[PDB]
């Protein structure tokens with residue numbers, strides 16, 4: 702996991718790489734994409750992901766109201782747009798917070814299911830930015846830095862945004878664990894994208910709630 706652990710590259714080099722990825726993204730386009738779809742994706746990266754991901758993670762969305770209908774529409778529009786954007790395959794990174802109770806159970810070959818959209822960056826510097834602050838919660842959480850091998854599901858949204866080199870998955874993405882390294886304050890987890898329907902005879906867990914997902 703030294704790609705993650707090592708010191709960040711300079712602003713200049715990271716900004717350059719992000720710009721090159723944005724360029725590659727645009728160059729790799731799509732003609733079917735709507736104005737509402739481009740606009741939803743631009744908004745997504747800045748603020749929209751906050752509402753969409755809360756909706757996707759919510760135990761009870763009967764309480765949301767008119768805002769639920771808007772959230773469903775937004776999610777549908779973002780998923781539709783994603784399918785029209787260029788695929789990315791290669792390595793990407795994501796920093797997040799996970800229940801220690803789940804982390805304690807995890808082994809290589811277990812599958813993690815993200816109920817929200819999954820946003821990753823090709824730049825570990827950018828990934829590390831989004832997990833700096835410890836959230837407040839009833840739950841004991843620990844910082845997790847994922848190294849993600851992407852061979853399906855990931856689409857670049859960097860063409861439509863930003864120096865984030867962002868690659869996005871639709872909700873319910875499944876990730877098979879290939880390696881775990883546990884330390885104090887940081888757990889590193891290597892994962893590979895897998896198709897849900899190809900997951901057999903292993904244990905799946907919901908990455909947010911920590912609950913087992915039915916085989």
Ligand SMILES: N=C(N)NCCCCN
Nearest residue numbers: 746747795796797820831
């Ligand atoms: N990596 C996270 N924890 N969050 C991703 C935020 C997505 C912003 N474009």
